[PDB]
Design a protein around this ligand. Structure first.
Ligand SMILES: CCCCCCCCCCCCC(=O)O[C@@H](COC(=O)CCC)COP(=O)(O)O[C@H]1[C@H](O)[C@@H](O)[C@@H](O)[C@@H](O)[C@@H]1O
Ligand SMILES: CCCCCCCCCCCCC(=O)O[C@@H](COC(=O)CCC)COP(=O)(O)O[C@H]1[C@H](O)[C@@H](O)[C@@H](O)[C@@H](O)[C@@H]1O
Ligand SMILES: CCCCCCCCCCC(=O)O[C@H](COC(=O)CCCCC)COP(=O)(O)OCCN
Ligand SMILES: CCCCCCCCCCC(=O)O[C@H](COC(=O)CCCCC)COP(=O)(O)OCCN
Ligand SMILES: CCCCCCCCCCC(=O)O[C@H](COC(=O)CCCCC)COP(=O)(O)OCCN
Ligand SMILES: CCCCCCCCCCC(=O)O[C@H](COC(=O)CCCCC)COP(=O)(O)OCCN
Ligand code: NA
Lengths: 75, 159, 75, 80, 79
């Protein structure tokens, strides 16, 4: 049998319906449901603004690897 | 003879200058390879800065220890290590004639990666002589770590 | 700028048409053409026969990880 | 000494290849630092223009760095 | 007992020759496994070159140290 939502997993039982549920890494994990992929809303860093230091880049942008990185478009 | 056992810094600075001159010659000959020489003069140019550790006592003793370690013990280690590496590389190329072990250079690099903890023991490919390859790789790893252990211990009797 | 088939690659020039050609790992590599994926013909090990000791499994089978493995159907 | 070696080889690598994870000193410094902690990358899957010169630089860097680590370990035995 | 605790090199060279002869026998018996035997002989053929480190004092002492480290302490670790 399987562990249902809210039941303890990995101590003899795995979670069922893995397309919707997962067993976290918590030493007494309980089966939890996935969340929808909500795109990045406001309060993000726009193109040309500093990222990494308290603000992440918006949905269409990426933050390079630098001491003071700035958001830039994908590719 | 004295250059072989003394006055290394003059040789290293001279080699740096030779690389610079070759870079100039390639630059004016309409070649892209002048970059390849230039970087070899650049990297050496930084390491030669350790020459100036003399004039400070602690860094001078440290640099002298580096020099003598390289010139005494690492040569004896590297001779035996290279013999073992070449032998097992030839064995592996002979056993497996294709698929990342089709050349001696590639096999030598792949076996060298084990010495630095970046090996590959997945055994995913469909070779003809699988399960003989595994024995060779295990033996190579064990012997290489014996050699490294012996080097480390040999450097403790000198302290 | 690019190297053609049979020309020296990686010493300042990359080989063009990488969908059909590649630069090997040889310390003075020359650009070579890919080969077609010919399926496994006879002189292979069939299901239930010993693999690894001088004979690979045929294209429809896989060789497990063991001291004396035997060919088996894919998972 | 370690930082001297790291900066020198980082500058050489960035000059030789100015693109694809080696377009800045920060990224190249981190990538070379990874080799010191056993997390390196010697796959050489990218199609660089100066491959087989990049390989020689990386091998020399790794060998020198491990010589330095060994020398440190030996030197610290003179206090016991 | 003196066969094994002394004169290892004779045993190693003899085992190399045994691998070569088994390779020949498999070769003329129409078997593909001879390659396996051959490669083992080849591998041993290189490591046995360490025998010639005698006649050079520093390399000879280094090789003696390797010998005793293998034959004394590693066998306790591996168990
Ligand atoms: C990209 C690839 C880079 C490779 C570079 C490799 C590390 C460079 C390190 C540079 C350091 C410069 C230096 O300081 O050179 C070192 C040499 O280090 C080496 O072993 C280099 C191996 C070749 C000391 O040599 P020194 O000129 O001091 O000669 C000593 C006499 O002065 C003294 O009077 C005594 O007679 C004594 O016996 C002599 O030794
Ligand atoms: C594919 C897989 C390969 C496996 C290869 C494994 C390592 C090869 C190492 C090759 C070294 C060859 C050699 O030269 O062998 C060495 C011994 O190292 C070993 O073999 C270790 C085997 C464990 C010298 O042994 P030696 O014949 O000199 O006998 C000594 C006397 O002479 C002396 O007077 C004393 O009485 C002393 O106690 C005796 O020992
Ligand atoms: C040197 C090698 C060690 C590497 C791994 C160390 C991991 C330690 C975990 C610390 C911790 O903080 O572990 C907490 C308690 O778990 C335990 O660990 C119990 C034992 C505690 C006794 C030490 C959190 O676990 P939890 O309460 O189940 O989380 C659910 C709530 N969401
Ligand atoms: C011990 C192991 C170390 C591993 C990591 C070392 C990284 C060093 C960075 C070198 C560098 O050269 O880093 C540049 C200089 O800045 C600094 O980092 C200052 C701090 C220097 C003091 C160390 C990065 O500056 P940047 O503005 O982000 O460059 C983007 C261009 N617009
Ligand atoms: C310590 C670091 C260990 C890892 C790397 C070791 C690689 C060594 C290569 C061994 C070899 O056997 O590589 C040969 C050439 O190696 C040389 O560069 C010779 C220079 C003289 C010094 C050896 C193969 O020759 P090739 O022309 O490259 O083959 C292509 C033709 N089809
Ligand atoms: C230090 C590095 C070790 C890494 C490799 C680990 C080897 C242990 C194998 C244990 C085993 O139990 O391996 C079995 C015995 O074989 C031998 O190994 C013979 C030598 C035994 C003397 C050591 C093989 O049985 P099998 O092929 O899986 O049988 C199919 C039915 N399943
Ligand atoms: Na590692």
């Amino acid at each position: 049998d399987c562990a249902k939502e809210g039941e303890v997993c990995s101590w003899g039982k795995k979670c069922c319906d893995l397309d919707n549920f997962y067993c976290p890494m918590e030493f007494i994990p309980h089966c939890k449901k996935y969340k929808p992929y909500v795109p990045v809303t406001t309060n993000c860093a726009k193109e040309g603004e500093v990222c990494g230091w308290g603000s992440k880049c918006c949905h269409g942008l990426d933050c390079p690897l630098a001491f003071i990185p700035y958001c830039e478009k994908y590719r | 003879k004295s250059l072989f056992v003394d006055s290394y810094s003059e040789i290293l600075f001279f080699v740096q200058s030779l690389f610079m001159l070759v870079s100039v010659v390639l630059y004016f000959s309409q070649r892209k390879e002048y970059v390849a020489s230039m970087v070899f003069s650049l990297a050496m140019g930084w390491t030669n800065m350790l020459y100036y550790t003399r004039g400070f006592q602690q860094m001078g003793i440290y640099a002298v220890m580096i020099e003598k370690m390289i010139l005494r013990d690492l040569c004896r280690f590297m001779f035996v290590y290279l013999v073992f590496l070449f032998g097992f590389s030839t064995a592996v190329v002979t056993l497996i004639e294709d698929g990342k072990y089709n050349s001696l250079y590639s096999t030598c690099l792949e076996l060298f990666k084990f010495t630095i903890g970046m090996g590959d023991l997945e055994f995913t490919e469909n070779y003809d002589f699988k399960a003989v390859f595994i024995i060779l790789l295990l033996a190579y790893v064990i012997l290489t770590y014996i050699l490294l252990l012996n080097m480390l211990i040999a450097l403790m009797g000198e302290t």
